[PDB]
Amino acid sequence: KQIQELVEAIVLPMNHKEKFENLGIQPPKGVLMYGPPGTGKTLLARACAAQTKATFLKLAGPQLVQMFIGDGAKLVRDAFALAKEKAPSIIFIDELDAIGTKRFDSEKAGDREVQRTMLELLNQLDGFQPNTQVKVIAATNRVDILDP
Amino acid sequence: FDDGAGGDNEVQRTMLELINQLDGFDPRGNIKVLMATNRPDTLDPALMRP
Amino acid sequence: KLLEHKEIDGRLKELREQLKELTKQYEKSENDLKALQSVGQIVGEVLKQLTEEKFIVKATNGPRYVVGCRRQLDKSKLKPGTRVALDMTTLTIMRYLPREVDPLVYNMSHEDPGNVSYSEIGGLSEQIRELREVIELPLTNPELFQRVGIIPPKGCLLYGPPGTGKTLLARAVASQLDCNFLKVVSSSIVDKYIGESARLIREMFNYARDHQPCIIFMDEIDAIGGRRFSEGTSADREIQRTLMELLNQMDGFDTLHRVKMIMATNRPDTLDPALLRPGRLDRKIHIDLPNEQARLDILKIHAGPITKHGEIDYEAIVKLSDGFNGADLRNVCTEAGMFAIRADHDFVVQEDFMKAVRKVADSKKLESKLDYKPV
Ligand SMILES: Nc1ncnc2c1ncn2[C@@H]1O[C@H](COP(=O)(O)OP(=O)(O)OP(O)(O)=S)[C@@H](O)[C@H]1O
């Protein structure tokens, strides 16, 4: 049933947008995987990369952690622009918790570009700039590290 | 180890970077790694996975 | 016979238009060369008014200075808090600017959508009328309350079910009224430098009171990612002092000009008794789930953008499903549309609705702790 939800709710927007238009509904924006770290999460994104050809895009988590500051937000915008160039956009990020952090409630210090890439990731992602050619894949180990 | 105190976390960022470049999405190859710990119950199940 | 006058007029047209347009772009780019007189400035913000002609500015990497104006830069405009452009050599103030900072205030401010009708799901019995009194009527006339002398109704709490009286069925009259409808999901106050909580309370109100009758709306009063503990270790007075400074800048000590509070939640566990006094939550209200005919309402408005035959049994979906959520009927419509996508039909048959009943109402039953009311 997870393969059902996966294929029948991501690959059918890749091939049938009008089938949503003949009925008068709208495909969801944002699909999230979570659970124990052994059930196979990366495998499903790789099965997407195999059995679909609509511009698979991996994105590793702590690669977005930057030191030359200002690069990861630009990089996410580059990723969506590049996958926009090949309009059906299979977009996957692993360890979203490694960039989407619970905003820590403490003083004196703090890495900043996690927040910058977080704000720009949610900006490029959804809400602001909506588009029906974003197919959001993400998988994490834990859920209670994340933001509402 | 993280709740509403917000202290030491950057080493965990380094270690998640280690997991990322270590295993999953084209791992090592002809590399054999031995690890050791006196404290197995302080490990992460992002490395306990076979 | 004299088309050489038009071979001269055409030479005029072509050659003069081309050379004049090349020399016109050369005029504007000689002005771009003249911009090698307009050679750079600095930008800082006025931190205070030192003397009437002096100001302390803020180099954004570092130190603080003493400046003046150019000559006539309106020294009353340059209040502490404005941003100015600073000179490069003389370092003094050249030109004022707008802006301000982090979009966690902004992305909850005016990302705020609206509903396409007052009846986005249904059940508008006390909703239209009492929300109308608590917002719109004393903003139209404060003198009626000035027969008594009190601020406008201090705001209900939309509690009850999580999703028919929590986030849905909250923006009914808000769609109609359209005055100062911002969002506060109340995770944006639990900050990093933990005393930025009260500063962003100031940033909430002192940015709000412009659209003069303000709508202070707060979904999910105590919201951060996860669940909550009890009166022991650190599930503690963050909420209490933060909420009392909220209530401080809401009413009691500081407010101004017919601002309407609206609280709307049932999720938080730890709340102030002084939150619960008449004067800050002077009136409160309750919402049922549906009364089974508001089920019929939310279904008959959820039976919207669906190609059908006009035979969809509303009584069967109303009585046979028990979701008690406009979002549940949203899932019903979604999966019934997917089961018209399945079997390849444009129309969503009533049996696709009952397939939605079965699958959606069974996956619905994978939830525990189906109850929420604070205190
Ligand atoms: N259905 C399956 N069939 C075969 N092997 C599977 C299956 N599910 C999981 N696996 C195995 O489990 C591992 C894949 O899981 P993971 O690589 O951990 O996915 P994941 O994204 O890494 O999950 P986490 O939370 O990130 S560790 C590999 O060893 C796979 O061979």
Containing H/E element for A114?
A: helix A113-125
Residue C163 annotated as part of some ligand binding site: yes
- Residues of chain A found within 8 Å of residue B45, distances taken between Cβ atoms: 37, 141
Q: Does B1 touch chain A (CB under 8 A)?
A: no
Amino acid letter at C150?
A: I
Q: Which atom of ligand 1 is nearest to the CA of A140?
A: 25
Beta bridge partners of A91: A57, A136
CA–CA separation, C259 vs C142, rounded Å? 11
Judge whether B2 and A145 are in contact, CB under 8 Å: yes
Residue C40 annotated as part of some ligand binding site: no
Judge whether A141 and A97 are in contact, CB under 8 Å: yes
Structure tokens at A106: 């403490």
Q: Look at B5 and A106 and tell me if their CB atoms are within 8 Å.
A: yes
Chain C residue with CA closest to B7: the answer is C192
Burial of A121 (0-12, 13-18, 19+ CB in 10 A): buried
- Whose tokens are 């340059």? That residue is C78
Residue C164 annotated as part of some ligand binding site: yes
CA-closest candidate to residue B25, choices A38, A60, A138, A89? A60
Nearest to A60 among B6, B20, B45 (CB): B20
CA distances from C181 to A79, A102, C137, C209, C261 (A): 34, 27, 16, 12, 11
What are the φ and ψ backbone dihedral angles of C206, each rounded to 5 degrees? -75, -5
Q: Which residues contact C251 (CB under 8 A, 6 or more apart)?
A: C151, C154, C261, C279, C280
C45: left (phi over 0), alpha (psi -120 to 50) or beta: beta
Residue whose CA lies nearest to ligand 1 atom number 31: A40
CA distances from A121 to B5, C106, C186, C246, C312 (A): 26, 16, 21, 30, 42
SS3 for B29?
A: coil
Strands C48-49, C285-286: parallel, antiparallel or unpaired by DSSP? unpaired
CA–CA separation, C66 vs A79, rounded Å? 45
Establish whether residue A42 lines the binding site of ligand 1, counting it when its CB lies within 6 angstroms of any ligand atom: yes
CA–CA separation, C308 vs A13, rounded Å? 22
Q: At what angle do helices A42-51 and A2-15 cross, to 10 degrees?
A: 40
Amino acid letter at C69?
A: C
C91: left (phi over 0), alpha (psi -120 to 50) or beta: left
Residue B23 Cα, ligand 1 centroid: separation in angstroms?
Answer: 12
* Residues of C at the B interface, defined by Cβ within 8 angstroms: 192, 234, 238
Structure tokens at A36: 């124990």
Residue A135 annotated as part of some ligand binding site: no
**Angle in degrees, CA C81, C84, C86, rounded to 5:** 135
- Residues of chain B found within 8 Å of residue C234, distances taken between Cβ atoms: 3-5
* Chains A & B: contacts with CB separation below 8 Å: 41
Q: Which residues contact A109 (CB under 8 A, 6 or more apart)?
A: none
- Residues of chain B found within 8 Å of residue A62, distances taken between Cβ atoms: 13, 16-17, 20
Judge whether A62 and A114 are in contact, CB under 8 Å: no
CA–CA separation, C259 vs C248, rounded Å? 14
Containing H/E element for C264?
A: strand C260-264
DSSP notation for A11-47: HHHHH-SHHHHTTT----S-EEEES-TTS-SHHHHHH
Q: Look at B5 and A94 and tell me if their CB atoms are within 8 Å.
A: no
Residue whose CA lies nearest to ligand 1 atom number 5: A40
Residue B49 Cα, ligand 1 centroid: separation in angstroms?
Answer: 9
Nearest to A38 among B2, B20, B49 (CB): B49
C44, C45, C50, C52: CA torsion to nearest 10: 90
Structure tokens at C18: 């081309």
Beta bridge partners of C263: C157, C218
Q: Look at B45 and A37 and tell me if their CB atoms are within 8 Å.
A: yes
Q: Look at C337 and A147 and tell me if their CB atoms are within 8 Å.
A: no
Residue A75, number of CB atoms within 10 A of its CB:
15
Judge whether C213 and C158 are in contact, CB under 8 Å: no
Burial of C149 (0-12, 13-18, 19+ CB in 10 A): exposed
Residue C165 annotated as part of some ligand binding site: yes
Establish whether residue A41 lines the binding site of ligand 1, counting it when its CB lies within 6 angstroms of any ligand atom: yes
CA–CA separation, C265 vs C222, rounded Å? 9
**Resolution value, angstrom units:** 4.2
Pick from A43, A59, A95, A137 the residue to mutate for probing ligand 1's pocket: most ligand atoms within 8 Å of its CB: A43
Structure tokens at A94: 């692993």
- Whose tokens are 């929590």? That residue is C166
Judge whether C182 and C109 are in contact, CB under 8 Å: yes
Amino acid letter at C265?
A: T
Q: Look at A42 and B25 and tell me if their CB atoms are within 8 Å.
A: yes
Q: Look at A105 and C337 and tell me if their CB atoms are within 8 Å.
A: no
What are the φ and ψ backbone dihedral angles of C133, each rounded to 5 degrees? -65, -45
- Whose tokens are 């709740």? That residue is B3
Pick from A3, A32, A39, A44 the residue to mutate for probing ligand 1's pocket: most ligand atoms within 8 Å of its CB: A39
Residue B20, number of CB atoms within 10 A of its CB:
19
**Angle in degrees, CA A15, A17, A22, rounded to 5:** 130
CA distances from C340 to A25, A54, C300, C307 (A): 11, 25, 19, 10
CA–CA separation, C16 vs C36, rounded Å? 29
- Whose tokens are 């969002």? That residue is C183
- Residues of chain B found within 8 Å of residue A100, distances taken between Cβ atoms: none
Q: At what angle do helices C326-341 and C350-363 cross, to 10 degrees?
A: 120
C220: left (phi over 0), alpha (psi -120 to 50) or beta: left
- Residues of chain A found within 8 Å of residue C338, distances taken between Cβ atoms: 8-9
Establish whether residue A110 lines the binding site of ligand 1, counting it when its CB lies within 6 angstroms of any ligand atom: no
- Residues of chain B found within 8 Å of residue A145, distances taken between Cβ atoms: 2
Ranges of beta strands (E only) in C103-249 are 158-159, 215-219
- Whose tokens are 């990369």? That residue is A49
Q: At what angle do helices C326-341 and A2-15 cross, to 10 degrees?
A: 70
CA distances from B20 to A79, B14, B17, C68 (A): 19, 10, 5, 54
- Best of C105, C220, C224 to substitute, by most chain A Cβ atoms within 10 angstroms, is C224
* Chains A & C: contacts with CB separation below 8 Å: 64
CA-closest candidate to residue C190, choices B2, A112, B1, A106? A106
Experimental approach: cryo-EM
Q: Which residues contact C351 (CB under 8 A, 6 or more apart)?
A: none
C368, A33, A118, B1: CA torsion to nearest 10: 70
Judge whether C191 and C297 are in contact, CB under 8 Å: no
Q: Look at A24 and C238 and tell me if their CB atoms are within 8 Å.
A: no
Judge whether C114 and C171 are in contact, CB under 8 Å: yes
Give Rg (Cα) of chain B. Answer: 13
